[PDB]
């Protein structure tokens, strides 16, 4: 048996909210500006530290513990950049035109690397989309968990069971928010369509990292090399 299927929507939200990783700080000092190496150096250091919290966060996600060690590795290997991005997009939600990689690291469209502006714009666009939708924290934590369980599910009936539970959780929140039945379906559809774009940004971002790796620009951490190799 499992415990994720048993939890109600309110207890589902609570568990996810309680599981939320902290917002890590960067090593950024506003002294020297950013070269293509220094900026990516900061981001690599930041992302590598974020991963450690994500892995332990994933173990707090209802149902993820019930999975095998092999399956847990696969799901994290597939969705780690997606989860980083949606977290990034969420942090930058109330900072129009900016990306909040860290509270002390606020990057503009001008800042940032050959091929970074394309990814930045898509990230900014996603952030602008969350802002117009007035995304709630309760919806965000649900979406982030959906990405973890979904992004590597076709590469299972229990995973789809938890996924269905998160769907119910989302609808329950919208019903509470006073939305009509058709407004719930529309917003539910709107939220999940964004995940397709987050997937797109991840694939684009992943290819940029592999480009940075082979070019031997700034050295990637040992964990980031492993997560990147899993995408080949």
């Amino acid at each position: 048996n499992s415990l994720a299927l048993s939890l109600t929507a309110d207890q589902m939200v609570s568990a996810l909210l309680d599981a939320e990783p902290p917002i890590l700080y960067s090593e950024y000092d506003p002294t020297r500006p950013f070269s293509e190496a220094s900026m990516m150096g900061l981001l690599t250091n930041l992302a590598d530290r974020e991963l450690v919290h994500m892995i332990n966060w994933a173990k707090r996600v209802p149902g993820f513990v019930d999975l095998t060690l092999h399956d847990q590795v696969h799901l994290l290997e597939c969705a780690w950049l997606e989860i980083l991005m949606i977290g990034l997009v969420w942090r930058s939600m109330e900072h129009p035109g900016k990306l909040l990689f860290a509270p002390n690291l606020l990057l503009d469209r001008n800042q940032g690397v050959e091929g970074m502006v394309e990814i930045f714009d898509m990230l900014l666009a996603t952030s602008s989309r969350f802002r117009m939708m007035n995304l709630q924290g309760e919806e965000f934590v649900c979406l982030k968990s959906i990405i973890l369980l979904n992004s590597g599910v076709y590469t299972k009936d229990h995973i789809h069971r938890v996924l269905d539970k998160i769907t119910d959780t989302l609808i329950h929140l919208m019903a509470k928010a006073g939305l009509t039945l058709q407004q719930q379906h529309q917003r539910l559809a709107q939220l999940l369509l964004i995940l397709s774009h987050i997937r797109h940004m991840s694939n684009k971002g992943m290819e940029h990292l592999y480009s940075m790796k082979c070019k031997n620009v700034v050295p990637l951490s040992d964990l980031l090399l492993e997560m990147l190799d899993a995408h080949r």
């Binding site: 892995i55 994933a58 173990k59 060690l69 847990q72 590795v73 290997e77 964990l223």
Partner: peptide, 10 residues
């Protein structure tokens, strides 16, 4: 695998 270790502990 680092991801394998960080997952299994403790």
């Amino acid at each position: 695998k680092i991801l394998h270790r960080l997952l299994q502990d403790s």
